[PDB]
């Protein structure tokens, strides 16, 4: 039983699903509902801005990757591992990684490859949880994610 993995997969898969289909999953989040719910809401807020702001960089990258099937998704995971290969980890890289995943997920749906969205979410979660588990733990997992992106209203 790996709660950190389960929670991460739940958050990331639901964002990619709702981005691809355009409809939220109105089931409540699983055990540990508070953190996961705020994490997904934060992901919508920050992730949507990332895709809007950087739609150019995302579109160019997707065009060159030429993603067509589940094989191209596994090759995609190879590129994603390089997100931390310079020794640096932060929430900005992690949210950008997930945002591109949603961008790819939308593309996978318009080419009638919705079956690859679930593998895509699992790959992203694998990269995060299986190679950066220690860093996530030190941040307090998705609680750290929520707090970092919380915007302070200091009047």
């Amino acid at each position: 039983s790996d709660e950190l993995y389960r929670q991460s997969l739940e958050i990331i898969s639901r964002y990619l699903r709702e981005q691809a289909t355009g409809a939220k999953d109105t089931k409540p989040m699983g055990r540990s509902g508070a953190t996961s719910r705020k994490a997904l809401e934060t992901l919508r807020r920050v992730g949507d801005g990332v895709q809007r702001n950087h739609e150019t960089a995302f579109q160019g990258m997707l065009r060159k990757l030429d993603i067509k099937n589940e094989d191209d998704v596994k090759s995609l995971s190879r590129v994603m591992i390089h997100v931390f290969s310079d020794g640096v980890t932060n929430w900005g890289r992690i949210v950008t990684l997930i945002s591109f995943g949603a961008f790819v997920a939308k593309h996978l749906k318009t080419i009638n490859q919705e079956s690859c969205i679930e593998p895509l979410a699992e790959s992203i979660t694998d990269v995060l949880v299986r190679t950066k588990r220690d860093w996530l733990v030190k941040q307090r997992g998705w609680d750290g994610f929520v707090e970092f992106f919380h915007v302070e209203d200091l009047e």
Binding site: V46, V50, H54, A57, M61, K64, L65, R78, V79, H82, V83, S85, D86, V88, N90, W91, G92, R93, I94, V95, T96, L97, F100, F148, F149, V151, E152
Partner: peptide
């Protein structure tokens, strides 16, 4: 993988933006 650094840099831009929020 030659695109790797692009997303790292974009990620650091996003992180540096919120780092003052």
């Amino acid at each position: 993988i030659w695109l790797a650094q692009g997303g790292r840099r974009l990620g650091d831009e996003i992180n540096a933006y919120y780092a003052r929020r």
